[PDB]
């Protein structure tokens, strides 16, 4: 009895948002790597879950084509969702990108491949109240997107136990979701909106 997500099928990403979509996908990967490393994950030729090695702890260009199409897609779907909800996105700050800097991480983050994540320094960016509302909307809708896929793939609500045989206790309406599970992907969609403001774009609600 989970809601339906918003329709982004007939939404075409306007070519003036192609660049910023590539920026978000780049930073999404940088944030992913930093978080993995801070959980102790190292690089390995192949991913071992006991050894905490992963092949994707690598520079973005060298990322396999399968993953880049998943990074760019999730970023493209974020933008497509913003358009469908009634938001208007415009570039209002050519100057602002020049004021953008990547964080310099210490040496312990660098791996054997020589890759060191360099995420954007978005601490100075502070969101506006209606923008912070918009981050909740994208979070709730990303959930309905995710739940729609898993249900189509044959997943059901399972009790608090999580079962590989296609049962997940997170398959509940969003209002019923645990507050701890909300923050994980809500903090990830909050940095995405900061990237837009950071590159000088303005996300105006409806």
UniProtKB/Swiss-Prot annotation:
Tissue expression profile of the protein: Brain, skeletal muscle, placenta and possibly liver and kidney. In brain, highest levels are found in the cerebellum, hippocampus, caudate nucleus and amygdala, with lower levels in the corpus callosum, substantia nigra and thalamus.
Top-level lineage group: Eukaryota
Location of this chain's protein in the cell: Sarcoplasmic reticulum membrane
Mapped Sequence repeat ranges: 1-105, 106-206
Function: Cytosolic calcium-activated calcium channel that mediates the release of Ca(2+) from the sarcoplasmic reticulum into the cytoplasm in muscle and thereby plays a role in triggering muscle contraction. May regulate Ca(2+) release by other calcium channels. Calcium channel that mediates Ca(2+)-induced Ca(2+) release from the endoplasmic reticulum in non-muscle cells. Contributes to cellular calcium ion homeostasis. Plays a role in cellular calcium signaling.
Subunit text: Homotetramer. Heterotetramer with RYR2. Interacts with CALM. Interacts with FKBP1A. Interacts with SELENON.
Family: Belongs to the ryanodine receptor (TC 1.A.3.1) family. RYR3 subfamily.
Domain topic, free-text comment: The calcium release channel activity resides in the C-terminal region while the remaining part of the protein resides in the cytoplasm.
Disorder noted: Congenital myopathy 20: An autosomal recessive neuromuscular disorder characterized by variable manifestations. Some patients have congenital limb or distal contractures manifesting soon after birth, while others develop muscle weakness with difficulty running and climbing stairs in early childhood. Additional features may include facial dysmorphism, and delayed development with intellectual disability. Skeletal muscle biopsy may show variation in fiber size with type 1 fiber predominance and atrophy, hypertrophic type 2 fibers, and abundant nemaline bodies.
Protein name (database record): Ryanodine receptor 3
Organism: Homo sapiens
Full-protein positions shown: 849 to 1054 of 4870
């Amino acid at each position: 009895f989970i809601p339906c997500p918003v329709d982004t099928s007939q939404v075409i990403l306007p070519p003036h948002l192609e660049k910023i979509r590539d920026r978000l996908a780049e930073n999404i990967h940088e944030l992913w790597g930093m978080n993995k490393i801070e959980l102790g994950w190292t690089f390995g030729k192949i991913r071992d879950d006991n050894k905490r090695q992963h092949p994707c702890l690598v520079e973005f260009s060298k990322l396999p084509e399968t993953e880049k199409n998943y990074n760019l897609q999730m970023s493209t779907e974020t933008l497509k969702t913003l358009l469908a909800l009634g938001c208007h996105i415009a570039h209002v700050n050519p100057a602002a990108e020049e004021d953008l800097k990547k964080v310099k991480l210490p040496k312990n983050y660098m791996m054997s491949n020589g890759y060191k994540p360099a995420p954007l320094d978005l601490s100075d960016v502070k969101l506006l109240p209606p923008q912070e509302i918009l981050v909740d909307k994208l979070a709730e809708n990303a959930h309905n997107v995710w739940a729609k896929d898993r249900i189509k793939q044959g997943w059901t609500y399972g009790i608090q136990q999580d079962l590989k045989n296609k049962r997940n206790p997170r398959l509940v309406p969003y209002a019923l979701l645990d507050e701890r599970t909300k923050k994980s992907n809500r903090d990830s969609l909050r940095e995405a909106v900061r990237t837009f403001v950071g590159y000088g774009y303005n996300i105006e609600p409806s």
